[PDB]
Amino acid sequence: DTKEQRILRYVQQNAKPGDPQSVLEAIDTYCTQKEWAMNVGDAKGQIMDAVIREYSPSLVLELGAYCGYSAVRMARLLQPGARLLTMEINPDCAAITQQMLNFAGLQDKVTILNGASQDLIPQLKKKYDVDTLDMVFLDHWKDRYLPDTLLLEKCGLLRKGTVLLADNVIVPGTPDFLAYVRGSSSFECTHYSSYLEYMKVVDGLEKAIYQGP
Ligand SMILES: O=C(NCCc1nnc(-c2ccncc2)[nH]1)c1cc(-c2ccc(F)cc2)cc(O)c1O
Ligand SMILES: [Cl-]
Ligand SMILES: [Cl-]
Numbered sequence: 001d002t003k004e005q006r007i008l009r010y011v012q013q014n015a016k017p018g019d020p021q022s023v024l025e026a027i028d029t030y031c032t033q034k035e036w037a038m039n040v041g042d043a044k045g046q047i048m049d050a051v052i053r054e055y056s057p058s059l060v061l062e063l064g065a066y067c068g069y070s071a072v073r074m075a076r077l078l079q080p081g082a083r084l085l086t087m088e089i090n091p092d093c094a095a096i097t098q099q100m101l102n103f104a105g106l107q108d109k110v111t112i113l114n115g116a117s118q119d120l121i122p123q124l125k126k127k128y129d130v131d132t133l134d135m136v137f138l139d140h141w142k143d144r145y146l147p148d149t150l151l152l153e154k155c156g157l158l159r160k161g162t163v164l165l166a167d168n169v170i171v172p173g174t175p176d177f178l179a180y181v182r183g184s185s186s187f188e189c190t191h192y193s194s195y196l197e198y199m200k201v202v203d204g205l206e207k208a209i210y211q212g213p
C-alpha cells in the first residue's frame with residue numbers, strides 16, 4: 001500500500017471514532033515514529049488553532065488537504081453551523097481525507113473536493129454557494145499560492161478582513177507569494193516562525209489579512 005493508506009489505517013486502529021484530538025495524536029505519533037509525511041503537524045498546528053480561535057470563521061477554504069490532518073484540526077474548532085471546503089488534487093488522498101473526516105466525526109462540517117485549485121476556485125460561488133470566504137488556508141502546491149490568491153480576488157471570494165494563512169512559506173518556500181503579500185497595501189501580514197512538521201528545520205506560517213482593493 002501507500003504511506004497515506006498506512007496513516008489512515010493507523011488512525012483507525014489507534015484513535016477513537018468521533019474524537020478529533022485522538023485522530024491528530026495518532027497521525028502525529030505515526031509520522032514521528034514510523035514515516036514522515038507532509039501534514040502541518042502539531043507545532044504549526046498549534047499556531048493554526050490560535051488563529052482559528054481568534055477569528056472563529058464561518059466559512060473556511062483549504063487548498064491542499066493531503067490526508068485531512070489540517071481539516072480535522074480546523075473543523076474540530078469551528079462553531080456550530082460553520083463549514084470548511086477543502087481541495088485535494090490527488091484522488092487517492094481525497095478519498096483518504098474523506099475517510100479521515102468520517103472517522104473523526106467531522107463529515108457534516110467539511111466538504112472534500114477532488115481537483116485542481118485553478119479549476120475549482122472559479123466554481124465555488126455557483127456550484128458550492130459561496131459568497132465570500134472568512135479564511136483561506138494555503139497548503140497546496142507552493143508555486144500556486146500567488147496565482148491562486150490573485151484568482152480568489154478576481155473571483156470576488158475575498159472580503160475586507162478575509163484571513164489568508166499560508167503553510168510552508170520557508171520550506172519548501174513560497175518566495176513570490178511572500179514578496180507579493182508583504183509588499184501589497186491590500187494585505188496586512190504577520191509571520192509566525194515555527195518548524196517543518198516532525199523536523200528540526202525552521203519553517204513558518206504567514207498570515208495575510210485582505211484589506212480590499
Ligand atoms: O507539497 C506539499 N503540499 C501540497 C499538497 C497538496 N495537496 N493537494 C494539493 C493541491 C490541491 C489543488 N490544487 C493544486 C494542488 N497540494 C508540502 C510539501 C512539504 C515538503 C517539505 C519538505 C520536503 F523535503 C518535502 C516536502 C511540506 C508540506 O507541509 C507541504 O504542504
Ligand atoms: Cl495537513
Ligand atoms: Cl510537528
Ligand SMILES: [Mg+2]
Nearest residue numbers: 040139167168
Ligand atoms: Mg504544508
